[PDB]
Every structure is written in structure tokens, then in C-alpha cells.
């Protein structure tokens, strides 16, 4: 009996190099189609089981526009008819499920986000600059006990403005009992996510609903 | 110039029959691998554009375990059981508003995704659960506001906590919180609070006090 857990750290390396690492990990030989090309950035500081490794492999394949098909009782890598980095961030002081609704709004159309519940981590696809930002958001989000939130679907306003309005109101103390509460803007769906301790969070909801006129 | 919108109604028909309907719609010839077999149930009461049709095709392919590849300079269907696929159009609010509210009633064996262009959603589940979810959406759509609050129960049990709140509202024991609703997500052990602002805020206070 022997069970291993892997940490992957590949930056700007070839796609065929990552597939090579994966096959050496999983023990599965893949047939790489000649048109398979590209440079991938894959980092996982969290130690992954065999399944969690495979999960991360398919994620990287989908992110870079390829798919795994079963031809002649072996896996074949063919394309599914910009450079995106991939990071596996482990949540330590709460279950991942709690964070997904909160970081999902900072993820674009080109980017992807999915949980690895077994590892209590999440896989993210985005640009190098946005990934360092989202990683920083997670890092700050993990500390808290409560991850209870409120959603405001704006109609009379514009989310980017409405949030800039609220953050200015909190900083100057013009927002009554709002010290310690956060605002997340989802431009895609035009909605606000309200966070922080119960008393504070409730006051921000009243404040933001009054701003929709 | 000429543009079309299709409505598909295929129940218990062969996979190769649906692929045939799709190719006749899209105008793209697909090469089916011999191992591709199965009976599919696909219904869309909402009229779909070419793109929205293709979206629905790939969804059905993923749901039944196949994938589309550009192999040999043509599109090929290769592999990546009582499932149905329905396209439900939301009439009053944008789909984005109702996805967080119905998503908890969707299992692992299923899948839910929005067609924002058609303001509809594609769901894969069993025939019995799909009829249930379809009438949940049909009831949820009527309202104006779909703003909501989430309570992550860290002590109690969601099924109980919700039954507790619904009883408190019916008898009027829940103060200034009329016309509000509670959604239970057992998987994540959390409560979703809905309804008019004033009412919804009172229920949040009521449900947070119940977590001890």
C-alpha cells in the first residue's frame, strides 16, 4: 500500500511538459495531437490527491481549449471546437463553498472558478495580475467566522458607481454603523454583495437600497 | 437576409435523431462515432437563435457523456441515464436574478446554466424533478425584487430552521415580516431569505437569533 499527494509549480512551460508531469503523476499515457501547443502557468501550493490532480489537469485543458477523449482504450488530447494562469488556493479557516459566491463576482467571462471540495481549495483561471488580486481577496476573506451576505440587484443605478459611493461613505464615517463591512461589485449581473458583521451589514443594505432611485 | 428561431420537442428519441435535428438547424455536418448511443429528452418552449441552439446541443452532449472535437477537418462526436433537458424562459426578471434561488434544488447528477441572450436556463435532471423545478421558477418569476440574504447555519440544521421560520410567519409570530420567503440548501447548510426589503431584514434578525 502507497498513497501520494502532489504540489505542482510550472510557470511559462510548454503544454506537452505539463501533460508529461500529469502522466508521470497519474500513471496514464496520453496521445497528444500534433496541433496541441502553448505555454501554461500552473501552481498548487496545496498537496493534491490523484483525483484532485486529474481535476486540475482537465481544468488546464479546458482553460487552454482542449478536451480528453477515449480512443483505442487510452486518452487522446484534441481541441474543443490570450495566456491564462491557473492557481489552486486552499481555504483554511472555513469551507470553500462559503467563499465561492463572494469571489465568483471578481471572475471575468474568459476566466474560470471551480471548487475542489476534497482538498477544500478552488481552481482559478485568469491573467497573472487578476489572479494575484483574487488570491489577496481570498487571503483577507479566510480570517472571518461569518460569511453571511446580502445581494442587491441594482436597476436604477450602475454597480461600479454605487460601490465607490458606499466605500467613500464608510471611510469618512458618513456611513452610520458600517465600520467593518465590505462591498463586492458584480458588473456582469449588475449586483452588489454586502458582507461583514451582522449589525454593520444590515445598515449597508438599508444604505444601498436607498441609493437605488 | 433571413434569420430563424427554433423550438425543439424531442421525447425519448435516439441521440443520432437529435444530432440530425441539430445539423438540419445549424447546417453543420457532424461525424458520429459508432459507440454513441442513447435516448434523449430535449424540450425548449422558447424560440432559440442559431447560437442558443448550438449551446443546447453541447449541453445535451455533455449531459449524456460526449464531446465535440474538430478532428480531421470536420466536427466529430466522441465520448468524454434517465435524464431530461429543458429550456425555461424567465418572463418578468433577468435569468441571473433566479439562478442563485433555484441552484440549491439542483443535484450533482444534474446541471444548470443560463442562456442570457434568450433569458432562459438549461436544466438537466430526472423527469419528476424537472417538473418540480419548472413550477418553482414559474412561482418565483411573479415578484419584482429578487434581492436576497444568506445565512450560513453553523449550529442548527437548515430543514428544521426553515420549518421554524415558516411557522413563525403564518401565525404572525414573526414581527413586521409579511410576504417573505425562506429557501433551504441542505448541501451547504444555509438559508436563503427573500421578499420585500423591510420584511426580509426582520427575517434575517429572526434567523440569526435562532443560530445558538
Residue numbers in the entry:
A (entry chain B): 48 to 128, 142 to 273
B (entry chain A): 48 to 127, 142 to 273
What's the publication's text?
In Pseudomonas aeruginosa, the Xcp T2SS plays an important role in bacterial virulence by its capacity to deliver a large panel of toxins and degradative enzymes into the surrounding environment. Secretins are large homooligomeric assemblies of 12 to 16 monomers forming a distinctive bipartite ring-shaped and cylindrical structure on their C- and N-terminal sides, respectively. The periplasmic N domain of secretins is constituted by the succession of structurally independent subdomains labeled N0 to N3 (7–9). Here, we revealed that the N-terminal domain of the T2SS secretin XcpQ from Pseudomonas aeruginosa is able to self-assemble into a hexamer of dimers independently of its C-terminal domain.
To gain deeper structural information on XcpQN012 multimerization, we endeavored to determine the 3D structure of the purified recombinant XcpQN012 by X-ray crystallography. The overall structure of the XpQN012 monomer, refined at 3.0-Å resolution, showed a typical organization into three subdomains, N0, N1, and N2, where each subdomain abuts the next in an N0:N1:N2 arrangement in three dimensions. The crystal structure revealed an axial dimeric association of XcpQN012 organized in face-to-face fashion. The dimer packing is stabilized by the interaction between N0-N0* and N2-N2* subdomains from each monomer (the “*” corresponds to the second molecule in the dimer). The dimerization seems to be driven by the N2-N2* contact with a buried surface of 600 Å2 that represents about 60% of the total buried surface. Most of the contacts between N2 subdomains are localized within the β9 strand interacting with the β9* in the facing N2* subdomain, creating a continuous 6-stranded antiparallel β-sheet. In contrast to XcpQN012, the N2 subdomain of GspD is not in contact with the N1 subdomain. This difference results in a high root mean square deviation (RMSD) (4.36 Å) when the two structures are superimposed. However, a slight difference was observed between the packing of the two XcpQ dimers, due to a general displacement of monomer B toward monomer A. This leads, in the present study, to a more compact dimer with a larger buried surface area of 1,040 Å2 compared to 880 Å2 for the previous structure.
